[PDB]
Amino acid sequence: RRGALIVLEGVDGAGKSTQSRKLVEALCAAGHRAELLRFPERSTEIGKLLSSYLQKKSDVEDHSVHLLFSANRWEQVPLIKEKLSQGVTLVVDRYAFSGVAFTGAKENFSLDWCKQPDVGLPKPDLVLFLQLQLADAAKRYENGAFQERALRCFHQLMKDTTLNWKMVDASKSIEAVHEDIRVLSEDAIATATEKPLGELWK
Amino acid sequence: RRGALIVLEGVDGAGKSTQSRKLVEALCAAGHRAELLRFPERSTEIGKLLSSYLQKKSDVEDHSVHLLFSANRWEQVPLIKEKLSQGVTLVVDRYAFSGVAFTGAKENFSLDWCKQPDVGLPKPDLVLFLQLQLADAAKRYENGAFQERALRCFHQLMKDTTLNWKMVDASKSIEAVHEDIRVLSEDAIATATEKPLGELWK
Ligand SMILES: Nc1ncnc2c1ncn2[C@@H]1O[C@H](COP(=O)(O)OP(=O)(O)O)[C@@H](O)[C@H]1O
Ligand SMILES: Nc1ncnc2c1ncn2[C@@H]1O[C@H](COP(=O)(O)OP(=O)(O)O)[C@@H](O)[C@H]1O
Ligand SMILES: Cc1cn([C@H]2C[C@H](O)[C@@H](COP(=O)(O)O)O2)c(=O)[nH]c1=O
Ligand SMILES: Cc1cn([C@H]2C[C@H](O)[C@@H](COP(=O)(O)O)O2)c(=O)[nH]c1=O
Ligand SMILES: [Mg+2]
Ligand SMILES: [Mg+2]
Ligand SMILES: [Mg+2]
Numbered sequence: 001r002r003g004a005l006i007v008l009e010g011v012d013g014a015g016k017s018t019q020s021r022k023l024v025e026a027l028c029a030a031g032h033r034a035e036l037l038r039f040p041e042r043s044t045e046i047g048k049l050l051s052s053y054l055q056k057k058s059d060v061e062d063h064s065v066h067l068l069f070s071a072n073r074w075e076q077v078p079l080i081k082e083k084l085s086q087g088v089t090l091v092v093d094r095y096a097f098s099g100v101a102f103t104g105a106k107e108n109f110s111l112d113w114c115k116q117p118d119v120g121l122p123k124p125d126l127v128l129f130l131q132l133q134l135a136d137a138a139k140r141y142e143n144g145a146f147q148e149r150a151l152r153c154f155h156q157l158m159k160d161t162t163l164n165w166k167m168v169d170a171s172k173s174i175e176a177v178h179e180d181i182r183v184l185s186e187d188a189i190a191t192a193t194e195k196p197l198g199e200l201w202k
Numbered sequence: 203r204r205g206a207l208i209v210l211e212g213v214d215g216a217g218k219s220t221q222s223r224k225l226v227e228a229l230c231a232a233g234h235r236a237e238l239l240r241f242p243e244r245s246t247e248i249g250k251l252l253s254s255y256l257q258k259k260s261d262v263e264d265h266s267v268h269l270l271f272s273a274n275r276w277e278q279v280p281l282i283k284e285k286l287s288q289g290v291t292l293v294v295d296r297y298a299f300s301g302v303a304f305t306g307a308k309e310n311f312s313l314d315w316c317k318q319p320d321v322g323l324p325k326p327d328l329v330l331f332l333q334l335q336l337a338d339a340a341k342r343y344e345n346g347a348f349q350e351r352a353l354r355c356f357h358q359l360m361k362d363t364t365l366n367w368k369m370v371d372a373s374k375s376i377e378a379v380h381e382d383i384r385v386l387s388e389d390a391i392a393t394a395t396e397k398p399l400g401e402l403w404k
Binding site for chain 1: 266267270318322
């Protein structure tokens with residue numbers, strides 16, 4: 001009985017890390033086997049450079065840094081498939097969508113070129129998109145103009161009806177948003193998993 | 203007056219590094235400005251890991267290592283475009299084709315998925331393919347079966363008539379193959395450059 005692959009997405013400040021941490025805690029307290037993962041995962045060899053990049057300690061050519069973010073997801077694919085096969089539901093703080101939304105926010109980056117590297121990644125069973133006004137996120141790639149461009153790509157990605165997108169009202173309290181996400185998650189773990197793990201964008 | 207982008211391709215042992223080195227030397231002695239580059243370029247941050255991988259000092263998930271080879275080309279794109287704009291012809295020992303031929307040689311790697319990361323790279327003005335029997339290369343990804351699979355992909359790539367592919371009989375002596383390549387190169391530098399630098403596979 002496989003685990004569910006559940007991803008949280010949204011702009012900076014939307015609540016993804018807080019709600020990812022709290023989701024894994026609730027699911028585990030309710031007797032599920034569930035573990036947290038995040039992208040980029042700065043602890044691997046590839047991840048160290050993404051961190052540095054993001055921390056503006058290094059300049060990496062724009063297509064090069066896009067590909068390093070994707071390669072960082074692929075290096076975790078064997079772990080990802082192994083844990084899911086063992087019944088472990090994985091809660092993932094950012095995935096390919098952020099990947100495309102942040103690079104696709106840049107000039108001369110077609111969404112098509114940006115999606116290719118991640119074509120074939122484990123397909124999430126549920127994509128939670130933590131929605132909130134930009135000005136509310138800000139009060140909590142990190143500048144106003146860049147966040148608004150990324151949000152636009154996110155909206156272009158959510159037209160892909162092959163994915164199980166759920167909107168979450170991220171402007172509520174931590175606890176209210178958490179209960180919304182918990183209930184959606186329990187449902188995906190119970191029914192969305194009857195089908196074999198899919199492939200992203202293919 | 204831009205420089206030409208000239209790439210050499212072929213299986214292991216075909217002569218590419220020897221003929222790349224000798225081409226840059228001849229062109230320079232004939233008053234051209236020309237410089238050598240090679241892929242992977244193991245000296246950058248990304249390149250160190252590819253080297254290690256190839257030297258079997260590290261195991262990198264198959265899609266991850268494919269993307270690192272591509273990212274290694276993209277990080278050199280600003281240098282590449284700058285030198286060409288300054289009139290410097292670049293001789294390149296392996297490029298995107300080897301990239302696709304060696305990953306595309308693996309199981310479950312469509313040529314389509316393998317080409318995407320490199321879509322948009324500077325397009326070579328001339329691709330020299332150093333042709334020779336596998337058994338001759340061998341006497342000089344490195345095993346018989348892997349080389350023959352890569353050669354098959356190379357043949358699938360050469361059907362792309364948008365590229366200026368030239369076959370070179372790599373079974374002749376070093377000097378004979380060199381003169382063949384020199385003459386083809388002088389012609390590309392003199393006429394193939396009247397057009398702006400293109401974009402690979404787009
Ligand atoms: N619902 C919420 N209401 C108010 N503040 C919140 C809420 N969710 C998270 N925060 C705060 O906002 C900041 C960003 O939260 P975080 O979960 O790190 O967001 P993200 O990972 O999406 O950037 C943190 O200080 C966090 O405590
Ligand atoms: N035309 C040739 N005939 C015989 N040996 C050759 C010829 N070209 C190169 N070699 C030898 O074959 C080996 C591989 O050459 P190299 O240029 O490194 O090939 P590649 O870079 O394609 O792997 C070297 O020892 C080289 O001296
Ligand atoms: C996962 C991912 C994140 N990003 C970005 C979004 C954030 O600005 C940044 C750090 O993410 P984080 O705040 O979730 O750690 O990296 C990319 O640009 N590409 C990617 O593939
Ligand atoms: C350029 C490139 C080479 N390769 C391979 C071909 C060789 O087996 C290896 C070393 O190349 P080399 O002998 O030209 O240094 O790397 C890839 O697998 N992908 C790539 O993008
Ligand atoms: Mg976060
Ligand atoms: Mg060589
Ligand atoms: Mg396509």
